[PDB]
């Protein structure tokens, strides 16, 4: 339930939210994890 | 404040949340928009 703020970016012709290593460590996110994305 | 569920994926050597066109339309997200990402 921990969260972080980010910006939608364009990478490889896709709209993505890049998750830096620091943010992964703070929120406890690994590849494959399910997340909730909310527009602010 | 609208939200959608997604999975952290790996693309271009980065950990990202791909946002499909349908999800962008439902949540009202454009590139550059600030979003909140919460681990479920």
Numbering used by the authors:
A (entry chain A), B (entry chain A): 5 to 44
Reported in the publication:
Here, we study fold transition between distinct β-barrels by protein engineering and structural biology technique. Here, we discover that the previously reconstructed ancient DPBB sequence could also adopt a β-barrel fold named Double-Zeta β-barrel (DZBB), as a metamorphic protein. The DZBB fold is not found in any modern protein, although its structure shares similarities with RIFT and OB. Thus, these ancient β-barrel folds (DPBB, RIFT, OB, and SH3) could be readily interconverted by a few feasible mutations through the missing-link fold, DZBB, indicating their significantly close evolutionary relationships.
In contrast, design-4 was unfolded but still formed crystals in the presence of sulfate ions. The crystallographic analysis revealed that design-3 and design-4 adopted the homo-dimeric RIFT-fold. Thus, the short In/Del at the 1st loop position is the determinant for the fold transition between DZBB and RIFT. A single deletion in the DZBB sequence converted it into the RIFT fold. Most DNA molecules did not migrate from the well when mixed with the proteins with the stable DZBB fold (design-2, -18, and -19) and RIFT fold (design-3 and -4), indicating that these proteins formed large aggregates with dsDNA. In particular, design-2, -18, -19, -3, and -4 interacted with dsDNA even in high salt conditions (500 mM NaCl).
